[PDB]
Amino acid sequence: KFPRVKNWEVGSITYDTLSAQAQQDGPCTPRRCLGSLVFPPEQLLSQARDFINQYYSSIKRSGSQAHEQRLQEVEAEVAATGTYQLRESELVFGAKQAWRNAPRCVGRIQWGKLQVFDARDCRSAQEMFTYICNHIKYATNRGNLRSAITVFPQRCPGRGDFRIWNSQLVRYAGYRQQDGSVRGDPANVEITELCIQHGWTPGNGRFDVLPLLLQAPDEPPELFLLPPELVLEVPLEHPTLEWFAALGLRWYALPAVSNMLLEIGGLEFPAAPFSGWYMSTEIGTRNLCDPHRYNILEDVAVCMDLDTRTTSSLWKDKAAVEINVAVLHSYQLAKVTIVDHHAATASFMKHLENEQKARGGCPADWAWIVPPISGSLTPVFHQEMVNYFLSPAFRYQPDPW
Amino acid sequence: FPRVKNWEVGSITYDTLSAQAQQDGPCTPRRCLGSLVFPRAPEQLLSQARDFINQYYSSIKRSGSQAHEQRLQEVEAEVAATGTYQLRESELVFGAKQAWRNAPRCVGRIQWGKLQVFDARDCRSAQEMFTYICNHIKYATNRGNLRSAITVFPQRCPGRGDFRIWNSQLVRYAGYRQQDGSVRGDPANVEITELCIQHGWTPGNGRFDVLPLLLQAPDEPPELFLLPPELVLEVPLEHPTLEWFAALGLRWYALPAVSNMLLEIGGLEFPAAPFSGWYMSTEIGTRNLCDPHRYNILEDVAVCMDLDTRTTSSLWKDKAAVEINVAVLHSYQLAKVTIVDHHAATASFMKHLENEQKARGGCPADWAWIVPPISGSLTPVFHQEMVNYFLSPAFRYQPDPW
Ligand code: HEM
Ligand code: HEM
Ligand SMILES: Cc1cc(N)nc2cc(-c3ccc(CCN)cc3O)c(F)cc12
Ligand SMILES: Cc1cc(N)nc2cc(-c3ccc(CCN)cc3O)c(F)cc12
Ligand SMILES: C[C@H](O)[C@H](O)[C@H]1CNc2nc(N)[nH]c(=O)c2N1
Numbered sequence: 001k002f003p004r005v006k007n008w009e010v011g012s013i014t015y016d017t018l019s020a021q022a023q024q025d026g027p028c029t030p031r032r033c034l035g036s037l038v039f040p041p042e043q044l045l046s047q048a049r050d051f052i053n054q055y056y057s058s059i060k061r062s063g064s065q066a067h068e069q070r071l072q073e074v075e076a077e078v079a080a081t082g083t084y085q086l087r088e089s090e091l092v093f094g095a096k097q098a099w100r101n102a103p104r105c106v107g108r109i110q111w112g113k114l115q116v117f118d119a120r121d122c123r124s125a126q127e128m129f130t131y132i133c134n135h136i137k138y139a140t141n142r143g144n145l146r147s148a149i150t151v152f153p154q155r156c157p158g159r160g161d162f163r164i165w166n167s168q169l170v171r172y173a174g175y176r177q178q179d180g181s182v183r184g185d186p187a188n189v190e191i192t193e194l195c196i197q198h199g200w201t202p203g204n205g206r207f208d209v210l211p212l213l214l215q216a217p218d219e220p221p222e223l224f225l226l227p228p229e230l231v232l233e234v235p236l237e238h239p240t241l242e243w244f245a246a247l248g249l250r251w252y253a254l255p256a257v258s259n260m261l262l263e264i265g266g267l268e269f270p271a272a273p274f275s276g277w278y279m280s281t282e283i284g285t286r287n288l289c290d291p292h293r294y295n296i297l298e299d300v301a302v303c304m305d306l307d308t309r310t311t312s313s314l315w316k317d318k319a320a321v322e323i324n325v326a327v328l329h330s331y332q333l334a335k336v337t338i339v340d341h342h343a344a345t346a347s348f349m350k351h352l353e354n355e356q357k358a359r360g361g362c363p364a365d366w367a368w369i370v371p372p373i374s375g376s377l378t379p380v381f382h383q384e385m386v387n388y389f390l391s392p393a394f395r396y397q398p399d400p401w
Numbered sequence: 402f403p404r405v406k407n408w409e410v411g412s413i414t415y416d417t418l419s420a421q422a423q424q425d426g427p428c429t430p431r432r433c434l435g436s437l438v439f440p441r442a443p444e445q446l447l448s449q450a451r452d453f454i455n456q457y458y459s460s461i462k463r464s465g466s467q468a469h470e471q472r473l474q475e476v477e478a479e480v481a482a483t484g485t486y487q488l489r490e491s492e493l494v495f496g497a498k499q500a501w502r503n504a505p506r507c508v509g510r511i512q513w514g515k516l517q518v519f520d521a522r523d524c525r526s527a528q529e530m531f532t533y534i535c536n537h538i539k540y541a542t543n544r545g546n547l548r549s550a551i552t553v554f555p556q557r558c559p560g561r562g563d564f565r566i567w568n569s570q571l572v573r574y575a576g577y578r579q580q581d582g583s584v585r586g587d588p589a590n591v592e593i594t595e596l597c598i599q600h601g602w603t604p605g606n607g608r609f610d611v612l613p614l615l616l617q618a619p620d621e622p623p624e625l626f627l628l629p630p631e632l633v634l635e636v637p638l639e640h641p642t643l644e645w646f647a648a649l650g651l652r653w654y655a656l657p658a659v660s661n662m663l664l665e666i667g668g669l670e671f672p673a674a675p676f677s678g679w680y681m682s683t684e685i686g687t688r689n690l691c692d693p694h695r696y697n698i699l700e701d702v703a704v705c706m707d708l709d710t711r712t713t714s715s716l717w718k719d720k721a722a723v724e725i726n727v728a729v730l731h732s733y734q735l736a737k738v739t740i741v742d743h744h745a746a747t748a749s750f751m752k753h754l755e756n757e758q759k760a761r762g763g764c765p766a767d768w769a770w771i772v773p774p775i776s777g778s779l780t781p782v783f784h785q786e787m788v789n790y791f792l793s794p795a796f797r798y799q800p801d802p803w
């Protein structure tokens with residue numbers, strides 16, 4: 001009943017006893033595995049009680065006095081209001097745990113260090129924008145990036161919700177044409193029409209930072225331009241390919257995801273943007289080389305005078321590696337925090353071992369932990385993993401529209 | 402049925418075939434174990450046999466025909482009289498092809514219909530086994546124009562031991578456990594190398610010494626057979642532009658011929674049925690040569706390439722691994738030995754998935770094994786959602802026979 005988990009590079013064995021605690025059901029059954037799929041009243045009180053028990057056991061003071069006082073508080077709250085309020089220390093612990101529980105996050109070795117910005121007193125899109133801009137400024141920190149989450153008001157009955165319509169705080173525009181192609185980021189094609197629809201006058205470059213479409217409960221979403229000096233970008237150059245700079249490639253410093261829902265003890269925060277720093281393959285391999293993203297790999301290969309006529313020259317691989325080199329060099333040159341996939345996966349291995357001792361296991365999504373280049377060159381490739389859903393958790397959620 | 406999305410193009414399919422999944426995998430709604438390497442009698446044999454016969458008669462578009470009905474009754478009567486049954490020759494060929502077609506971890510299944518099936522079911526000694534295997538190797542190697550083949554030795558049956566090939570592949574390099582705890586040759590083959598010596602093989606000391614075969618006939622200890630060196634086609638490894646690469650003295654063999662899996666067809670089990678195709682270059686270049694627990698040559702190549710191995714952010718590992726994969730492809734193409742790079746192999750697997758969606762409404766595919774070990778998202782299978790499940794006929798892992 002406790003899955004055996006082996007590391008095939010070292011031969012070491014552990015058992016995931018944490019998987020027993022799995023809150024919610026994943027997509028898999030004994031008949032078929034769907035691990036590779038991207039998107040796989042008194043209920044409130046059972047989850048709330050679960051979380052409080054978690055919390056007090058984690059500070060060692062469960063069973064004891066403040067524990068029961070807190071439980072009867074939440075009981076009375078929900079009886080009075082239909083919902084309840086997290087203590088600020090519970091929100092902090094809940095945000096950290098939700099990060100610590102994220103199976104697809106390779107950066108979780110950092111989970112203890114997270115700046116939680118309590119925006120639960122937020123009203124209006126204009127205040128959200130101020131919280132968000134403060135977040136961006138704090139997290140960017142002139143390039144020495146610091147992990148942060150800003151928690152906007154929870155969903156409540158009868159009332160609408162705070163939503164950030166943008167998937168991330170920094171998103172480059174994607175424009176179609178009557179030639180069908182996209183200029184800019186094909187991923188953001190949709191939020192770009194939405195920004196234009198809502199009044200944004202579009203740029204026409206490959207790296208036009210989008211406005212933020214912030215939405216207050218029931219209110220239409222309001223367009224907000226981000227101060228250029230707030231949005232730190234890194235122009236991309238290569239240490240030895242001097243023509244690489246001239247490709248005009250750039251990316252932004254701050255990976256700040258703003259469309260996921262934070263769930264803590266049955267409470268749901270549909271707006272809680274969090275940010276860390278980038279792993280270099282996210283930019284250099286996925287964002288710039290995905291066929292359905294900037295898809296620049298053949299451009300770079302042409303500039304390297306590679307033989308793109310045959311797959312077997314591995315021109316795709318050589319071009320991809322040099323784009324990742326350019327990303328690493330360019331971020332380092334700009335003194336912007338970045339981590340390469342070897343360092344990050346080596347740290348995740350440490351995280352796995354710490355979590356094995358800390359709580360008997362760690363939910364990890366192998367397909368997402370293994371980097372998108374040089375998979376088996378990293379130690380996570382040889383690490384068996386168990387994927388399960390613990391709470392508190394970050395969850396995907398429907399789009400607001 | 403599970404909806405399955407390709408994220409490169411946006412296309413959506415539903416895997417209705419998974420609904421027919423026989424045997425259970427290791428996952429539950431509680432927890433996914435899809436990344437685990439080894440996750441794992443009259444009337445159940447009959448449901449397995451009838452389902453197989455039904456598959457055979459569908460494959461030739463004669464379902465519900467009198468030949469179909471008659472064969473089912475024929476199998477029924479033999480199981481009732483004997484507790485087992487015998488495949489017809491045509492069913493064995495079809496069943497071996499189906500087991501390949503059903504292998505979720507095989508990215509090379511575009512080829513599944515082109516399989517030479519050698520019927521060795523009348524084999525009776527380890528010596529005849531060896532002769533069948535040499536024929537297999539000769540046929541499949543085909544002096545470097547590789548041909549997919551399977552030789553099927555006699556099925557398991559009550560009251561008689563199994564035929565087994567102890568080696569995990571027909572061609573393996575010796576792995577000599579140094580007393581330091583280190584290994585000279587291939588660390589993956591330390592156990593089988595020790596069994597070879599203990600069974601009378603006089604070892605070598607090189608890093609690419611072809612192992613002898615340990616062949617087990619029913620109720621008989623394994624017998625040692627040396628492969629004729631001219632049967633074992635090998636490729637010296639050189640790089641197209643890194644001339645010092647040749648000096649590393651690296652080689653690999655032409656023929657990937659796995660010999661330790663169990664073939665299951667219609668509830669019958671064939672514990673010895675070695676099968677072979679041709680290599681995808683990342684198996685040699687990335688896993689076999691660069692796995693830290695295999696030949697582990699990555700640092701040495703990167704040092705020789707003059708890369709800064711003191712910091713990971715130079716991506717020296719990725720650069721050295723790519724050139725090693727280049728060397729493998731260049732060297733096999735030079736030697737005129739079939740090989741496919743991971744880009745061609747994965748593009749062809751995408752075609753396979755499309756063929757199989759039309760043909761059977763789905764395809765069992767193990768994403769972690771289908772995505773190549775380097776450059777994963779540069780290949781289209783990275784962006785393809787996949788459903789992993791177990792169909793029969795099937796190739797299955799089985800215990801080591803010692
Ligand atoms: C500190 C440096 C961090 C690094 C290097 C890092 C790295 C990564 C990477 C590479 C991914 C895969 C994303 C993709 O492929 O698009 C990911 C996902 C994720 N990260 Fe981290 N991350 C960091 C910080 C954080 C923080 C601060 C949080 C939350 C407070 C967090 C929560 C998550 C979650 C929930 C996911 C998965 C979301 C999903 O299911 O799609 N991470 N991270
Ligand atoms: C013809 C060219 C072929 C290519 C390029 C190819 C490719 C591959 C690759 C790259 C793997 C993963 C191997 C590993 O990571 O160690 C694999 C696994 C596998 N292949 Fe193929 N293959 C071919 C032919 C065949 C044939 C002819 C058969 C059977 C008749 C077959 C059956 C299998 C099976 C059963 C597995 C998975 C075994 C396991 O569960 O570990 N393949 N193949
Ligand atoms: C905190 C954090 C840090 C980082 N360095 N990277 C991150 C990437 C994602 C992420 C972005 C988009 C998607 C869906 C589109 N592929 C899934 C994600 O996990 C994320 F949420 C959070 C990230
Ligand atoms: C027919 C075939 C062709 C090929 N080109 N490659 C193949 C690789 C494996 C294979 C080999 C070893 C292991 C376990 C050791 N990692 C698992 C496998 O799937 C296999 F069975 C069959 C293969
Ligand atoms: C189909 C497949 O699940 C999809 O391409 C996944 C694979 N692994 C991933 N891994 C990471 N880190 N990020 C991703 O977006 C994905 N996408």
Ligand SMILES: C[C@H](O)[C@H](O)[C@H]1CNc2nc(N)[nH]c(=O)c2N1
Pocket residue numbers: 008381382383384385436437438769770771772
């Ligand atoms: C732990 C993990 O499942 C293991 O390393 C797997 C991952 N994917 C693989 N994929 C292939 N094709 N071959 C392998 O040996 C492996 N190893």
Ligand SMILES: [Ca+2]
Pocket residue numbers: 178179
């Ligand atoms: Ca037009």
Ligand SMILES: [Ca+2]
Pocket residue numbers: 487
């Ligand atoms: Ca008969």
Ligand SMILES: [Cl-]
Pocket residue numbers: 255282283287
């Ligand atoms: Cl990103």
Ligand SMILES: [Cl-]
Pocket residue numbers: 657684689
């Ligand atoms: Cl191999």
Ligand SMILES: [Gd]
Pocket residue numbers: none
């Ligand atoms: Gd030029």
Ligand SMILES: [Gd]
Pocket residue numbers: 642643644
């Ligand atoms: Gd040279």
Ligand SMILES: [Zn+2]
Pocket residue numbers: 028029032033034035428429432433434435
């Ligand atoms: Zn699963």
